[PDB]
UniProtKB/Swiss-Prot annotation, chains A, B:
Residue positions the entry lists as glycosylated: 206
Coverage span on the entire protein: 141 to 391 of 459
Domain of life: Eukaryota
Organism: Homo sapiens (Human)
Lineage of source species: Eukaryota, Metazoa, Chordata, Craniata, Vertebrata
Protein's cellular compartments: Nucleus; Nucleus, Nucleolus; Cell membrane; Cell projection, Microvillus membrane
Record-listed Zn(2+) binding positions: 86, 88, 111
Mode of membrane association: Single-pass type I membrane protein
GO terms (BP aspect): morphogenesis of an epithelium; response to hypoxia; response to testosterone; response to xenobiotic stimulus; secretion
UniProt name for this protein: Carbonic anhydrase 9
Variation of activity with pH: Optimum pH is 6.5.
Residue ranges of domain Alpha-carbonic anhydrase in the record: 1-250
Residues at which substrate binds: 192-193
Sorted UniProt keywords: Cell membrane, Cell projection, Disulfide bond, Glycoprotein, Lyase, Membrane, Metal-binding, Nucleus, Phosphoprotein, Signal, Transmembrane, Transmembrane helix, Zinc
């Protein structure tokens, strides 16, 4: 499978034709304030330099495999473990976030994918209610260099080739995410690549993360994908809410 | 295990000492209004007279086995099939609801137990978040005979003995539930007997159903339980929320 070029995605996984897919356009006006949504809690995200982490150009994103030990709670009794994180971006002058706010596409987006601590494996969690949880944050142009992101961005040149990987030192994974864990959107959706299984809880931060224009250029300009093509605009088309209500942790 | 007997339920099932157990005390003024909570959808609940349904004294409750085809949705794509329903009740002038409202115990309580359509079997859903969903309604004393309940209450006579069962005509299961499907409490908890599995979504109707004094007496006074005992007071004490916020579908 590929972005903007066959095989159709439903031919690959029937679930890519589900009614309740991601990503979506968030309209803060139409979002339901629910005071039940408490601040997110992360434990174990401040990793030491060893052991090293695998960072892979899988031809559709740059993915960092996370170690055991990273615990995330959406609430009381809603407990997850982190599996991996990856990035969606655009191209020169073209934004590449997957979610949009009131139609606005941001330059890039980070996904931290988590498994419910009721399941031992992704294959058991797929399509099950709350089986997987993704933390999502927009990346926007700022005037400073983000030093958290520099640790990963400085290594992209080593994995320029499609299907290439390198080992990188552990780092504060929570420093790749906004500082505000209390203000977010939450809805139920899908994986955004085959098999596009439903039952995924998406949590989308209101606060964005700032990278420098060069950082965003390094992200969009370094990696290569299927064929002799740049790895760029690696975002799925926005999917209709189809009657789902997006909740907001804030009024 | 027995009710108000021994052993200690944590000795039978250590799961019964989990942090997120049911039932709970609902305090409506501390409930969180979430507008995302939609009206419950129940299709296929209007059963014809044939085939007949199994009604069973199991020593802990009276249990009606439900056929296939009773579909329930808590939201969009969050679907369930009804498996069975059973009751909780007190004794001569003593109430026996499981859930309580600001400390008030109601005469009796109906539980309609459903299985997520993402799971083929109950044993796969046990302990998984959203695997099971229970619809709970309070039964209160009213001036009139309830004709839906009479279909069950009039058959308790011939299953008075622990482990006896009878076949009853199909009835309209939705006629046992309250008027307004848009008005309910919701939280995540447990089975209220061993094995006390967590991940059960509890929906408690705001509105009650009314039975005659005589009907409530028939419920509390007809059935025999473990040993040469009356099957009465078959409820579990209220359990601490431990940071869980109870949600309300109405302001
Ligand atoms: N881009 S995504 O929704 O965040 C995504 C899509 C497909 C996956 C398949 C397996 C594990 C994690 C996955 C994450
Ligand atoms: N009272 S309850 O929470 O509705 C309850 C208790 C024990 C069960 C055991 C097996 C299947 C369903 C069950 C439901
Ligand atoms: Zn992604
Ligand atoms: Zn029950």
């Amino acid at each position: 499978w590929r972005y903007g070029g066959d095989p159709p995605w439903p031919r690959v996984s029937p679930a890519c034709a589900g009614r309740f897919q991601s990503p979506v356009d968030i309209r803060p006006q139409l979002a339901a304030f629910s005071p039940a949504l408490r601040p997110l809690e992360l434990l174990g995200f401040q990793l030491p330099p060893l052991p090293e982490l695998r960072l892979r150009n899988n031809g559709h994103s740059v993915q960092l495999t996370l170690p055991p030990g990273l615990e995330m709670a959406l609430g009381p009794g809603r407990e997850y473990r982190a599996l991996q994180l990856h990035l969606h971006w655009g191209a020169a002058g073209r934004p590449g976030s997957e979610h949009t706010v009131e139609g606005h596409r941001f330059p890039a987006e980070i996904h931290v994918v988590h498994l419910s601590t009721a399941f031992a494996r992704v294959d058991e969690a797929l399509g099950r209610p709350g089986g997987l949880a993704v933390l999502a944050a927009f990346l926007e142009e700022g005037p400073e260099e983000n030093s958290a992101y520099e640790q990963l961005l400085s290594r992209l040149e080593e994995i320029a080739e499609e299907g290439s990987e390198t080992q990188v030192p552990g780092l504060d994974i929570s420093a790749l995410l906004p500082s505000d864990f209390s203000r977010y959107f939450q809805y139920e959706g899908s994986l955004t690549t085959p098999p596009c299984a439903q039952g995924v809880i998406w949590t989308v931060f209101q606060q964005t993360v700032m990278l420098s224009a060069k950082q965003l250029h390094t992200l969009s300009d370094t990696l290569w994908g299927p064929g002799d093509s740049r790895l760029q605009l690696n975002f799925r088309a926005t999917q209709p809410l189809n009657g789902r209500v997006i909740e907001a942790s804030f009024p």
